[PDB]
């Protein structure tokens, strides 16, 4: 819909930023574990209800 509180708009603003993939260099840190981002998301599944 068009309506939204602004407080709710930001929560989706944050969650849009967090969907980016794991940087390529950060795999190369010495003693590194993280490979691909495990918290990624797609609106088609697991819907935020904010």
């Amino acid at each position: 819909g068009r309506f939204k509180p602004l407080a709710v708009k930001k929560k989706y603003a944050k969650k849009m930023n967090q969907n980016k993939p794991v940087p390529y260099w950060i795999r190369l840190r010495t003693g590194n574990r993280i490979k691909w981002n495990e918290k990624r998301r797609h609106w088609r599944r697991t819907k935020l209800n904010y």
Partner: protein, 81 residues
Amino acid sequence: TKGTTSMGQRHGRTHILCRRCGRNSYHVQWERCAACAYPRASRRRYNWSVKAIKRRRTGTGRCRYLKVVNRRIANHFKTPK
């Protein structure tokens, strides 16, 4: 048709986000946080679920004002001379 069919009759939301508890437990028609009891002064904790109390414990957050005072108390409130 208590169904798949009537499962698509579900419209709107009975619970929205809350200010303190931060969950989706805030009831709208009347106004409460089903989890954080907001707006009661005292929070909501029951001893019939202890698994639940330990998601509300003093530890789980950032403890920002615990980290400082515990350091003052341990150091006995030092000051410069």
